[PDB]
A paper describes a structure:
SisCsx1, as other members of the Csm6/Csx1 family, is composed of an N-terminal CRISPR-Cas-associated Rossmann Fold (CARF) domain connected to an α-helical higher eukaryotes and prokaryotes nucleotide-binding (HEPN) domain by a helix-turn-helix (HTH) domain. The SisCsx1 monomers are curled around the two-fold axis to form a dimer, and three of these dimers oligomerize through their HEPN domains into an equilateral trimer, thus assembling into a hexamer. Each dimer contains a cOA4 binding site at the vertex of the triangular assembly, and a catalytic pocket located 70 Å away inside the triangular oligomer along the two-fold dimer axis. We show that cOA4 binding activates a cooperative sequential catalytic response in a hexameric SisCsx1 complex and that the RNase activity is switched-off by Ring nucleases, which cleave cOA423.
The Cα backbone built in this map was later combined with an iodine derivative of a better diffracting crystal of SisCsx1 in the space group I212121 to determine the structure of the apo SisCsx1 to 2.9 Å. Subsequently the apo SisCsx1 structure was used two determine by molecular replacement two SisCsx1 conformations in complex with cOA4 at 3.1 and 2.7 Å resolution respectively, thus providing the molecular details of the RNase activation by the secondary messenger. To explore these differences, we crystallized the SisCsx1-cOA4 complex by soaking the compound in crystals of the apo SisCsx1 at 25 °C, and we also co-crystallized the complex after heating up the mixture of cOA4 with the isolated SisCsx1 to monitor possible conformational changes that could elicit the RNase activity by the presence of cOA4. We synthesized cOA4 using purified Type III-B SisCmr−α complex, and observed that the binding of cOA4 at room temperature, barely activates SisCsx1, while heating the reaction mixture triggered full RNase activity. The phosphate inversion in cOA4 is stabilized in both cases by hydrogen bonds of the phosphate groups of A1 and A3 with N158 and N158′ through a water molecule. A rotamer change of H155 in both monomers allows the polar interaction of the imidazole group with the A2 and A4 bases in each monomer, thus positioning the cyclic compound into the cruciform pocket.
Residue numbers in the entry:
A (entry chain A), B (entry chain B): 1 to 454
RNA sequence: AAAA
């Protein structure tokens, strides 16, 4: 069900500290145990790098005894029922380190220089690839099977913690880390910091960036709820005014813009362009002020506790500026044609290349409505349709196939007695790709060049 | 252009140690300096937490003097060409970390034996949000205006390092980390591990997962090249036997499956389903064996250096198993309709809902071809078209609108003398979403229920 | 704050 994963470090350098989270204190010498008592996950998994403990039979059993040895030192009540419950799973490491030479699952001892000390087998040298370490931790997470993943990033090497964070990200883990000062001591009430929001904020930004790149709103993570809930407890004059502007950013108009583009509502997408231009012009202003605020963060201490205003979400939204152009609605539609081409939306690109010359034609004749009852449209459409069938036979063929899809007269499939269908034509993946990406612009530009003379 | 970023720690417990990267060798007391003369970047940014030091005038100048104070104790032999060109930028922190006092241009300190002990500030308490820290670091990265980002995750608090890693990810940074593992005692040759590949492998998996989720091949990160260029020099009989299978996984058939689905080649997508079923049935077998290999990684040390085989890339690909179903091509197309609905591909869902009942009808009559010359098709199409226009007027309307898009008779826009277009029907995002997500399946099931009696 |  709920599993706590933690990467192990050298316990001989641990002291009793009073870890804190929301006021619910936990007195221990390692953060993993504190988080166990707080969250109380059903399964606890500690990853121990081969860099640490080493023995003749079981390194996992030596680590279990190493922790109870530092529980017998400093006189701690726990580690008997706890370490018995913990599932110890060994992981690979890289670089040079010092391991411990245990006798028989019990770490050994030998007095060197000052007095009794663990005889560390100082040389350990292994060259491993971080993705080998990644694959080792991944397999543990995957086959472990949990409904809720909890990852402790407090203890362990910076290499293993970063690797563990990226594994956890693929299992929708909650991340925790409890950083402390160099040997604090008694009554050290250090805070456990949750990092879940930070890993989500970066995933959200990469998704927002790709959403504008591939003209898809399904990838745009809507931060409407975050901004609407955002409120300054204490606001210090013009740190209240700029937040008012940010809270009022129409992120819904951006999502709708991407929806219309994706779904082929080309006239609506283009009509929204000037509104969007004013949305991101304000967003540019807001972000410069917010950037300046966080660059001189010492003066805007009021934002120190805020979790709803994330700079990357807003900065990633500024990319939508690339989807915008200045000019008449025909020039805006012409730009959109190029956008569909780059984004590999073959269907929408071909339909726009077919219909835009009719509108171009209509404009030349003084205007009209896309309706069969309109004489100007009737003749304008007849001209572009017949000119396309006369010269650009390929354009018109790809258009109708993409428009009607597989189950259609355009593809001529055959349905049998058994309920099985055999395609009637070949789906030319690279020919469609090639035509749109290499000739649709050159062809369109020639069609519109001809229709200018009209 | 190329610029290095590092987060700072207490220079107090730092010893002069040699480093290693691509065979390069460099001796210093902190990894950031080693990486500086290894790569030689145009700018170097020193991110210093507010818990690190505290001066009456400039905390950045005290850190600048703190590092030269530690350089003096033993032979630093440097900082006359690295201490000039480094931009010190203060960052916020969290917790009860103990700060260290500063006065004008000096860090003070007192003897109290052991030579001259560090003047610990002793108590500091700040409760900040990790996204506030994230926004602070983001603003620094964003406004630094760099072409190539390089991030050092060796030094600093585990909270600040993980936060820095997620910021770096949004700037396409290369990540490096060199942990010590114990008492160095000079030299030791601590190795700097690059983590770029690990952060990319997880981003790639999230993209692969979303690609299957939204039926889009543009998001699927192709790992064919990795797989082909993968061959360990020494390989066991059981290792080779299963790696041979992995190297032969037809990831191209999965990408093509997603291409046909996105572009509406529904018959072809459905025909590929059985082939795909075998592709994933083997990939499951290989994943169980590889998972077992990485779970018992101590026996398969041949993989210890491999960077091409990423478990997450293959495991994420297994999600395509959800896109598959058993049954005749009509039953497979029926399932695909539900897939288009869940994926919010309104155009493809409505065209399939319109054409699938014609095929259903054709099957009942013993089969036929989707062609106007076929009598069975002619009548079958006439029946579903008239039944849809009779009972499901809405379905037929949304279908043609989405099929022809904005510039069409289906939307009736009006073109001006000025070249500006005013939409005709302005059909909303919600009316379309609600209809297909809430009614399309119930309506389709009733259409097919009726056509069974045929 | 290079196995808090």
């Amino acid at each position: 069900m709920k599993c706590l994963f933690y990467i192990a470090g050298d316990v001989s350098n641990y002291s009793i500290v009073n870890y804190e989270l929301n006021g619910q204190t936990q007195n221990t010498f390692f953060a993993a145990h504190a988080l166990y008592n707080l969250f109380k996950p059903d399964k606890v998994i500690a990853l121990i790098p081969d860099s640490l403990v080493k023995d003749n039979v079981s390194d996992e059993e030596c680590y279990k005894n190493l922790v109870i040895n530092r529980a017998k030192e400093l006189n701690f009540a726990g580690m008997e029922e706890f370490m018995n419950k913990v599932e110890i799973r060994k992981i690979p490491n890289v670089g040079i380190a010092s391991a411990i030479q245990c006798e028989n699952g019990a770490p050994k001892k030998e007095k060197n220089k000052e007095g009794r000390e663990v005889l560390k087998r100082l040389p350990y040298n292994e060259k491993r690839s971080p993705i080998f370490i990644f694959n080792a931790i991944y397999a543990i997470f995957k086959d472990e099977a949990c409904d809720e993943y909890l990852v402790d990033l407090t203890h362990g090497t910076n290499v293993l913690v970063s690797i563990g964070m990226n594994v956890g990200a693929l299992f929708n883990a909650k991340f925790y880390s409890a950083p402390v000062m160099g040997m604090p001591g008694k009554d050290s009430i250090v805070n456990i910091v949750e990092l879940t929001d930070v890993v989500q904020a970066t995933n959200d930004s990469l998704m927002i960036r790709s959403s504008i790149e591939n003209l898809d709103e399904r990838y745009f993570k809507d931060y409407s709820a975050k901004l609407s809930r955002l409120n300054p407890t204490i606001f210090e004059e013009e740190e209240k005014k700029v937040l008012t502007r940010v809270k009022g950013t129409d992120v819904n108009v951006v999502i709708n813009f991407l929806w219309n583009i994706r779904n082929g509502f080309t006239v609506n997408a283009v009509k929204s362009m000037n509104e969007l231009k004013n949305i991101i012009n304000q967003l540019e202003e807001d972000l410069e002020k917010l950037k300046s605020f966080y660059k001189n963060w010492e003066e805007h201490k009021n934002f120190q506790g805020e979790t709803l205003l994330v700079l990357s979400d807003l900065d990633s939204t500024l990319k939508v500026k690339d989807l915008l152009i200045e000019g008449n609605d025909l020039e805006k539609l012409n730009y959109l044609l190029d956008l569909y081409i780059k984004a590999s939306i073959y269907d929408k690109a071909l339909s726009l290349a077919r219909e835009l010359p009719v509108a171009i034609c209509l404009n030349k004749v003084g205007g009209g409505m896309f309706d069969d009852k309109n004489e100007k449209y009737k003749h304008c459409n007849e001209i572009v349709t017949s000119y396309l069938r006369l010269r650009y036979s390929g354009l018109m063929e790809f258009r109708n196939t993409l428009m009607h899809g597989g189950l259609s007269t355009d593809m001529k499939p055959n349905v049998d007695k058994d309920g099985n269908i055999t395609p009637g034509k070949i789906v030319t993946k690279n020919k469609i790709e090639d035509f749109v990406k290499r000739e649709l612009r050159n062809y369109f530009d020639k069609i519109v060049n001809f229709l200018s003379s009209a």
